[PDB]
Structure 1
Amino acid sequence: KMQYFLSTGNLVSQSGLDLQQVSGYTVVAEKINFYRFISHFRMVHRGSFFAQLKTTT
């Protein structure tokens, strides 16, 4: 079940964590060059809830 989280990114939880989305939690570490690869690890994301908003604040 932990592999299913890491294979899809879908968060199945009977509680619901304190988080506001249920998907996209894991990405593919690409190796097309090293700059692509090292910058997956310095990358941070605001949340997928904010990708659907029309406000640019």
Structure 2
Amino acid sequence: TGLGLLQDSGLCVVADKLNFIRYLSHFRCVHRGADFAKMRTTTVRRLLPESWGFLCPVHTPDG
């Protein structure tokens, strides 16, 4: 049973101490899902106004 998850990869990742600002950002990251990296429509990438105070507007990978 997939554990009621919907994702079966990228569940754990390497935490790299290149800097202490790369390391501290692994324990505050939130991944919408690894399947959404393959989608024609871009609507799970919209920065809605309901993530005010819960997700940072600026801190997102830029590729």
Structures share a fold, TM > 0.5?
Answer: yes
| Number of residue pairs aligned between Structure 1 and Structure 2 | 43
Give, in whole Å, the separation in 1 of the partners of 2:21 and 2:35.
28
1:1-57, Cα deviation, whole Å (9 max, x unpaired): xxxxxxxxxxxxxx2211112111001110001000001111000001111111111
Q: Tell me how large the CA RMSD over aligned residues is.
A: 0.8
User: Which residue identity lines up with residue 52 of structure 1 in the other structure?
Assistant: K
- The yes-or-no answer on 1:23 pairing with 2:9 is yes
Give TM-score, length-normalised by structure 1: 0.69
Give, in whole Å, the separation in 2 of the partners of 1:27 and 1:20.
18
Give, in whole Å, the separation in 1 of the partners of 2:12 and 2:2.
17
User: 1:29-48, aligned counterparts within 5 Å?
Assistant: 29-48=15-34
Give TM-score, length-normalised by structure 2: 0.63
Q: What percent of counterpart residues are identical?
A: 60
Query: Where does structure 2 lack aligned partners over 5 or more consecutive residues?
Result: 44-63
Higher relative contact order (CA 8 A, sep 6+): 1
Query: Where does structure 1 lack aligned partners over 5 or more consecutive residues?
Result: 1-14
SS in 2 for 1:21: coil
Give, in whole Å, the separation in 1 of the partners of 2:27 and 2:2.
26
